[PDB]
Amino acid sequence: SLDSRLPAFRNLSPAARLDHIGQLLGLSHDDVSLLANAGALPMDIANGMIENVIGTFELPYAVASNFQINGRDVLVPLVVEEPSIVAAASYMAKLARANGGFTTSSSAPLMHAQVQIVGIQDPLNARLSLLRRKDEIIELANRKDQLLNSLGGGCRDIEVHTFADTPRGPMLVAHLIVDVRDAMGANTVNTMAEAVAPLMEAITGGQVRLRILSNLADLRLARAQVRITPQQLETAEFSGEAVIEGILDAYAFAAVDPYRAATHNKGIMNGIDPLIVATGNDWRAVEAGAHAYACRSGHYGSLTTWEKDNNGHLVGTLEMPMPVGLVGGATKTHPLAQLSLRILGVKTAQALAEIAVAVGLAQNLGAMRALATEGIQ
Amino acid sequence: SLDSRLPAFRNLSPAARLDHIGQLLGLSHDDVSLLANAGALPMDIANGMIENVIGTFELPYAVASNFQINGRDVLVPLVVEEPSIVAAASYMAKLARANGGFTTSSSAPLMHAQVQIVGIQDPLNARLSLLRRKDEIIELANRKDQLLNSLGGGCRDIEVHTFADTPRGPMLVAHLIVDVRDAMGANTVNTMAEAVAPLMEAITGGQVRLRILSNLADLRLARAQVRITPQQLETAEFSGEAVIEGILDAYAFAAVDPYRAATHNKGIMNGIDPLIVATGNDWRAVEAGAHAYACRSGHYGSLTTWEKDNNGHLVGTLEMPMPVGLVGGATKTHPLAQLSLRILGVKTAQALAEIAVAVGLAQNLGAMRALATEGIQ
Ligand SMILES: CC(C)(COP(=O)(O)OP(=O)(O)OC[C@H]1O[C@@H](n2cnc3c(N)ncnc32)[C@H](O)[C@@H]1OP(=O)(O)O)[C@@H](O)C(=O)NCCC(=O)NCCS[C@@H](O)C[C@@](C)(O)CC(=O)O
Numbered sequence A, B: 001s002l003d004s005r006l007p008a009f010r011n012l013s014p015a016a017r018l019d020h021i022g023q024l025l026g027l028s029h030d031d032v033s034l035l036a037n038a039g040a041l042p043m044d045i046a047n048g049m050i051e052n053v054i055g056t057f058e059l060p061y062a063v064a065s066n067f068q069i070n071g072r073d074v075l076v077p078l079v080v081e082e083p084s085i086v087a088a089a090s091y092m093a094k095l096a097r098a099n100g101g102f103t104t105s106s107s108a109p110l111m112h113a114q115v116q117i118v119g120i121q122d123p124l125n126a127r128l129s130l131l132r133r134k135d136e137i138i139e140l141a142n143r144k145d146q147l148l149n150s151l152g153g154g155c156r157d158i159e160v161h162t163f164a165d166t167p168r169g170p171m172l173v174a175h176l177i178v179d180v181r182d183a184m185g186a187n188t189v190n191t192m193a194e195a196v197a198p199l200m201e202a203i204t205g206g207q208v209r210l211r212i213l214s215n216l217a218d219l220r221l222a223r224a225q226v227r228i229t230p231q232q233l234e235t236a237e238f239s240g241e242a243v244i245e246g247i248l249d250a251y252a253f254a255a256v257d258p259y260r261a262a263t264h265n266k267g268i269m270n271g272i273d274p275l276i277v278a279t280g281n282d283w284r285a286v287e288a289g290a291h292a293y294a295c296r297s298g299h300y301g302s303l304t305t306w307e308k309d310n311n312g313h314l315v316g317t318l319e320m321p322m323p324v325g326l327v328g329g330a331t332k333t334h335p336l337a338q339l340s341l342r343i344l345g346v347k348t349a350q351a352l353a354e355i356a357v358a359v360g361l362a363q364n365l366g367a368m369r370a371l372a373t374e375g376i377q
């Protein structure tokens, strides 16, 4: 159906760009008019969104072209201040289309709720007392949020970890594992963590302290793949084969050197965070999950991978935590976050997460390609 | 002197808040008009900032109250979508004022430019060749930006790192260490890395690949301290002494468990990134430097520290990379970034960096204090 190629888009006026988007999507007049004039976020909404509001602050709102996800073309809205990002994403997506576009998958939308318990004399024994009573705790967690349960989410499981060696004594930390459906999940799981805390306290005999989600959302992973052939990467100076080898050298550099990995992953987030902003979502949560995950091994490394396959084609992956929502907060109340969701066509939060990692992978590829092909001056 | 306490700000309308800010600072009618009306970022500017622009996207623009930095009251603009951030930062700043406010310092604005060298069988020897000729390399770097040197910046040093055994062969990586004065520094140091590459090839006999800044800006540190007394933290349910103990428990939990540290550090960036956005700065760069620094030890831990001093008072620190500019990127392009810098009063980029880490420290304190008393919900 949709054709995201957007021929000539980069050279069109903003008004003509918006008209072409509107035709492809069948946008209503009200939708297009959200960009007829500045001020689409009414001040009454802005004033209800955060505290001490005195006005609004604009960033450019753009659409990356050419993206295709599991064979379906998609248009990607992005909000950011920095040049080259949107063009690089668009151009790498153009190259990806020739080899099948981006292929994506994701896990269920599972989030951790931590419950921290201090002052237990026998924490290792208390862990087993909690695990034996897992079903009772899960049932309690699922008591209140009737809507979530009806929609196919809810607390699925508990894990319990112990930290024997802290300067503040031993700590037991229970994790509720919660399917949050189309929410990012923080209010859902924080509510459950506060709800089960008295019962955990009764089972363990400790004092509950923190009841709080984890932003290291490593059970809520999204995955993207891309493939590029050497003919597509040939430049005036370098064969495509040589460019592929240069990109592999750049990847190996990021995998060994944290000073490079930080910059390399920053480029991924140049692609991802503007889509988070465009959909009214929390970009600090996505950033923290991204970079903490990059150093889960004890070494801060690259979130993407880059290889050559047995045909000599460049293949990239991005697998990372990606907690986002279609509901909640500004995603619902900002008229342009709703328009962004309309432009994307996503029907679940995990579908939005899959587009996010495709854009992050495309952005990293574009950044590496530029650096690997620039002549010595 | 300016008074940042902003009486009843929480309950004034956006218009009345803006009028009061304008009166405190002596803003002109035309400056106040930039926030009183939508559209301060005109489309010809937005269309020139990034590619494929179709419009602009607003976030609320707020001011946190009560902040005081090295004895001087400071108004802090913040652009973000999530509720309770601005309120919690203002609340914690209120408490800090009673004990001297926030005390800050920072290093010189030093940034790394990486120059990756491949193609030689003797990287360990080539590193010494580069160090032997380091003055010649530094002089060439500095010939490329005479204005920066006159402004008191420039390349100060080089350091060279080797990776003799990678899966892609031997590499060595030179770092130019560059004082970038009031810029974030990326374009400034990339230019120097390009300029020295041919000399580094001549010295080493190798091939230069990547020439690029590092976002792990660990020579560009900003520092903040805060102190809170137990009487300030007493609640109806908890003695202030008990709250202090509970905050130390929360800190120890972040220091041992990355699932908590990621969330703890996310709470810091809730305060920092909105100031970065409000000043037209690159928040992906600040995020990447923050989270990579947090795992420099081989364990992803807390950016802040929390302790109790000899008087029983709670004392907090935040020391972290903080690469921001007053010039460069979009700092000058966005009329409201310029207005933010006027509201802040900052005259150097390191002064902005110091305010950023004070806000981050305040934000973390606010999150932990709520989690250690009634809970975040
Ligand atoms: C502040 C609260 C939201 C409510 O305050 P309250 O009711 O207790 O006391 P109050 O006597 O009424 O007000 C005390 C002072 O607060 C300011 N103030 C109060 N309300 C105001 C308002 N509406 N407008 C303006 N200024 C207001 C104002 O300065 C006021 O002073 P005032 O006397 O008026 O001159 C508090 O619950 C509090 O901090 N909660 C913590 C919230 C928090 O951290 N959010 C972070 C985001 S979540 C997540 O992304 C991060 C994380 C948690 O996961 C991170 C992690 O896990 O680590």
Ligand SMILES: C[C@](O)(CC(=O)O)CC(O)O
Pocket: A082, A263, A264, A265, A266, A267, A270, A367, A368, B186, B212
């Ligand atoms: C090219 C960039 O530095 C990413 C990278 O180096 O891979 C990102 C840009 O914002 O500077």
